[PDB]
Amino acid sequence: HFHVFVGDLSPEITTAAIAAAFAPFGRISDARVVKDMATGKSKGYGFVSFFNKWDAENAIQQMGGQWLGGRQIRTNWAT
């Protein structure tokens, strides 16, 4: 698969929220908003995995800087 790192997530953004936000760019194999091991709160970042590389490429470029919830996010490739 092809993964996109999504940073600067507003605290209220859930895995489902980023899954929903990136759905328009292509088929998604899964998503995950990373959590804090102490509070269980969002760590402020997550990942969205696409089956296709071009879709992911388009999501990274188009979503970078977009407002998602209470914050403008950051996008990039991820392993």
Side-chain angles (χ1 to χ4, degrees), residues 6 11 15 17 20-22 24 32-33 37-39 44-47 51 55 58 61 68-69 71-72 78:
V6 303
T15 298
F22 283 77
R32 181 192 297 179
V33 164
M37 65 161 79
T39 63
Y45 67 92
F47 307 82
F51 292 88
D55 294 333
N58 300 333
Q61 176 56 47
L68 178 49
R71 258 255 266 195
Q72 296 185 64

Short mmCIF file of all heavy atoms in Angstrom, two decimals, residues 6 11 15 17 20-22 24 32-33 37-39 44-47 51 55 58 61 68-69 71-72 78:
data_model
loop_
_atom_site.label_atom_id
_atom_site.label_comp_id
_atom_site.label_asym_id
_atom_site.label_seq_id
_atom_site.Cartn_x
_atom_site.Cartn_y
_atom_site.Cartn_z
N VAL A 6 -0.40 12.35 8.24
CA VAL A 6 -1.20 13.56 8.37
C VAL A 6 -0.88 14.16 9.74
O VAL A 6 -1.21 13.60 10.77
CB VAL A 6 -2.72 13.27 8.26
CG1 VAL A 6 -3.01 12.59 6.93
CG2 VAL A 6 -3.19 12.38 9.40
N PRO A 11 -7.22 18.13 18.05
CA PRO A 11 -7.53 17.11 19.06
C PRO A 11 -8.80 16.29 18.84
O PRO A 11 -8.82 15.10 19.12
CB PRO A 11 -7.59 17.93 20.35
CG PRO A 11 -6.60 19.03 20.10
CD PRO A 11 -6.94 19.43 18.68
N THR A 15 -9.96 8.72 13.90
CA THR A 15 -9.54 7.91 12.77
C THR A 15 -10.60 8.01 11.68
O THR A 15 -10.28 8.25 10.52
CB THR A 15 -9.38 6.44 13.17
OG1 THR A 15 -8.36 6.31 14.16
CG2 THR A 15 -8.98 5.61 11.96
N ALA A 17 -12.66 10.35 11.12
CA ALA A 17 -12.71 11.69 10.53
C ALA A 17 -11.67 11.86 9.43
O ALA A 17 -11.96 12.46 8.40
CB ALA A 17 -12.51 12.75 11.62
N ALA A 20 -12.70 9.68 6.50
CA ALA A 20 -13.73 10.39 5.76
C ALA A 20 -13.17 11.54 4.93
O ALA A 20 -13.56 11.74 3.77
CB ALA A 20 -14.78 10.92 6.73
N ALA A 21 -12.25 12.31 5.51
CA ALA A 21 -11.66 13.45 4.81
C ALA A 21 -10.84 13.06 3.57
O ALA A 21 -10.78 13.82 2.61
CB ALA A 21 -10.78 14.24 5.77
N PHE A 22 -10.21 11.89 3.61
CA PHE A 22 -9.38 11.45 2.49
C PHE A 22 -10.06 10.49 1.52
O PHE A 22 -9.51 10.16 0.46
CB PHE A 22 -8.10 10.82 3.04
CG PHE A 22 -7.09 11.82 3.53
CD1 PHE A 22 -7.25 12.45 4.75
CD2 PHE A 22 -5.99 12.13 2.75
CE1 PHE A 22 -6.32 13.39 5.20
CE2 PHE A 22 -5.05 13.06 3.18
CZ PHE A 22 -5.21 13.70 4.41
N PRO A 24 -12.35 10.86 -0.64
CA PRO A 24 -12.50 11.37 -2.01
C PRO A 24 -11.34 11.11 -2.97
O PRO A 24 -11.54 11.06 -4.19
CB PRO A 24 -12.73 12.87 -1.80
CG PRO A 24 -13.39 12.92 -0.45
CD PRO A 24 -12.56 11.95 0.34
N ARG A 32 -5.62 5.59 10.86
CA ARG A 32 -5.31 5.54 12.28
C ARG A 32 -4.85 6.89 12.79
O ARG A 32 -3.95 7.50 12.22
CB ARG A 32 -4.22 4.50 12.53
CG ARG A 32 -3.83 4.34 13.99
CD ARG A 32 -2.55 3.51 14.13
NE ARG A 32 -2.71 2.14 13.65
CZ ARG A 32 -1.73 1.23 13.66
NH1 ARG A 32 -0.53 1.54 14.12
NH2 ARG A 32 -1.96 0.00 13.20
N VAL A 33 -5.49 7.38 13.85
CA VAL A 33 -5.08 8.62 14.49
C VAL A 33 -4.31 8.08 15.69
O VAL A 33 -4.87 7.28 16.46
CB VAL A 33 -6.29 9.46 14.97
CG1 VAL A 33 -5.83 10.53 15.96
CG2 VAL A 33 -6.97 10.12 13.77
N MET A 37 -0.44 7.28 25.17
CA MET A 37 -0.55 6.12 26.05
C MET A 37 -0.96 6.46 27.48
O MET A 37 -1.40 5.59 28.22
CB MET A 37 0.77 5.36 26.08
CG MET A 37 1.92 6.13 26.68
SD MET A 37 3.23 5.03 27.18
CE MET A 37 4.03 4.70 25.60
N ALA A 38 -0.82 7.72 27.87
CA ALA A 38 -1.18 8.13 29.22
C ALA A 38 -2.65 8.54 29.31
O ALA A 38 -3.41 7.98 30.10
CB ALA A 38 -0.30 9.29 29.66
N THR A 39 -3.05 9.50 28.48
CA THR A 39 -4.42 10.01 28.48
C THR A 39 -5.36 9.38 27.45
O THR A 39 -6.58 9.54 27.55
CB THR A 39 -4.41 11.53 28.23
OG1 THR A 39 -3.86 11.79 26.93
CG2 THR A 39 -3.56 12.23 29.27
N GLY A 44 -2.20 14.03 17.96
CA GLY A 44 -2.07 15.11 16.99
C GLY A 44 -1.63 14.69 15.60
O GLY A 44 -1.36 15.54 14.75
N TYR A 45 -1.52 13.39 15.35
CA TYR A 45 -1.14 12.91 14.03
C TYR A 45 -1.70 11.53 13.75
O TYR A 45 -2.15 10.82 14.66
CB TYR A 45 0.39 12.92 13.86
CG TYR A 45 1.16 11.93 14.72
CD1 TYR A 45 1.48 10.66 14.25
CD2 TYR A 45 1.60 12.28 16.00
CE1 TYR A 45 2.21 9.75 15.02
CE2 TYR A 45 2.33 11.38 16.79
CZ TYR A 45 2.63 10.12 16.29
OH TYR A 45 3.36 9.24 17.05
N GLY A 46 -1.69 11.15 12.47
CA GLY A 46 -2.21 9.85 12.09
C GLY A 46 -1.77 9.46 10.70
O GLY A 46 -0.93 10.13 10.10
N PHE A 47 -2.34 8.38 10.18
CA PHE A 47 -1.98 7.90 8.86
C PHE A 47 -3.22 7.44 8.10
O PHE A 47 -4.22 7.05 8.71
CB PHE A 47 -1.01 6.71 8.95
CG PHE A 47 0.21 6.97 9.79
CD1 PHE A 47 0.15 6.86 11.18
CD2 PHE A 47 1.42 7.32 9.20
CE1 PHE A 47 1.28 7.10 11.97
CE2 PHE A 47 2.56 7.56 9.98
CZ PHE A 47 2.49 7.45 11.37
N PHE A 51 -4.70 2.09 -1.52
CA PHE A 51 -4.29 0.92 -2.28
C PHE A 51 -3.41 1.35 -3.46
O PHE A 51 -2.52 0.62 -3.88
CB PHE A 51 -5.50 0.16 -2.83
CG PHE A 51 -6.35 -0.50 -1.77
CD1 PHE A 51 -7.38 0.19 -1.16
CD2 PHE A 51 -6.09 -1.81 -1.38
CE1 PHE A 51 -8.15 -0.41 -0.18
CE2 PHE A 51 -6.86 -2.42 -0.39
CZ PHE A 51 -7.89 -1.71 0.21
N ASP A 55 -3.30 7.91 -6.08
CA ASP A 55 -4.35 8.46 -5.22
C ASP A 55 -3.73 9.10 -3.98
O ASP A 55 -4.14 10.17 -3.55
CB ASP A 55 -5.32 7.37 -4.75
CG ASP A 55 -6.13 6.78 -5.87
OD1 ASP A 55 -6.36 7.47 -6.88
OD2 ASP A 55 -6.56 5.61 -5.74
N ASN A 58 -2.01 12.28 -4.81
CA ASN A 58 -2.98 13.36 -4.98
C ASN A 58 -3.53 13.84 -3.64
O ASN A 58 -3.78 15.02 -3.46
CB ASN A 58 -4.13 12.91 -5.89
CG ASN A 58 -3.65 12.52 -7.28
OD1 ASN A 58 -2.62 13.00 -7.76
ND2 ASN A 58 -4.41 11.64 -7.94
N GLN A 61 -0.75 16.08 -1.90
CA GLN A 61 -0.69 17.41 -2.50
C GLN A 61 -1.92 18.28 -2.27
O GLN A 61 -1.78 19.45 -1.90
CB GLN A 61 -0.42 17.29 -4.01
CG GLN A 61 -0.42 18.61 -4.77
CD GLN A 61 0.57 19.62 -4.20
OE1 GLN A 61 1.73 19.29 -3.92
NE2 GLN A 61 0.12 20.86 -4.04
N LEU A 68 -8.91 20.88 8.73
CA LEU A 68 -9.66 19.68 9.05
C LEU A 68 -9.95 19.87 10.53
O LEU A 68 -9.06 19.80 11.38
CB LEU A 68 -8.83 18.41 8.81
CG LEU A 68 -9.52 17.09 9.18
CD1 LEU A 68 -10.92 17.05 8.58
CD2 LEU A 68 -8.69 15.92 8.68
N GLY A 69 -11.21 20.17 10.85
CA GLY A 69 -11.54 20.41 12.24
C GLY A 69 -10.95 21.74 12.65
O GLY A 69 -10.94 22.68 11.86
N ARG A 71 -7.90 22.80 12.90
CA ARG A 71 -6.50 23.03 12.56
C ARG A 71 -6.14 22.71 11.13
O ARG A 71 -6.71 21.80 10.52
CB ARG A 71 -5.61 22.18 13.48
CG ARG A 71 -4.97 22.97 14.59
CD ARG A 71 -3.50 23.23 14.32
NE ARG A 71 -2.66 22.21 14.93
CZ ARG A 71 -1.35 22.33 15.11
NH1 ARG A 71 -0.72 23.43 14.71
NH2 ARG A 71 -0.67 21.36 15.70
N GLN A 72 -5.19 23.46 10.57
CA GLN A 72 -4.74 23.18 9.21
C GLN A 72 -3.76 22.02 9.36
O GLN A 72 -2.83 22.07 10.18
CB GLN A 72 -4.03 24.39 8.59
CG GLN A 72 -4.92 25.61 8.40
CD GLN A 72 -4.21 26.72 7.67
OE1 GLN A 72 -3.83 26.58 6.50
NE2 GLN A 72 -4.01 27.84 8.36
N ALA A 78 4.69 8.34 3.97
CA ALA A 78 5.02 7.62 5.19
C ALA A 78 5.29 6.19 4.79
O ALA A 78 4.77 5.72 3.78
CB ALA A 78 3.86 7.67 6.18
#
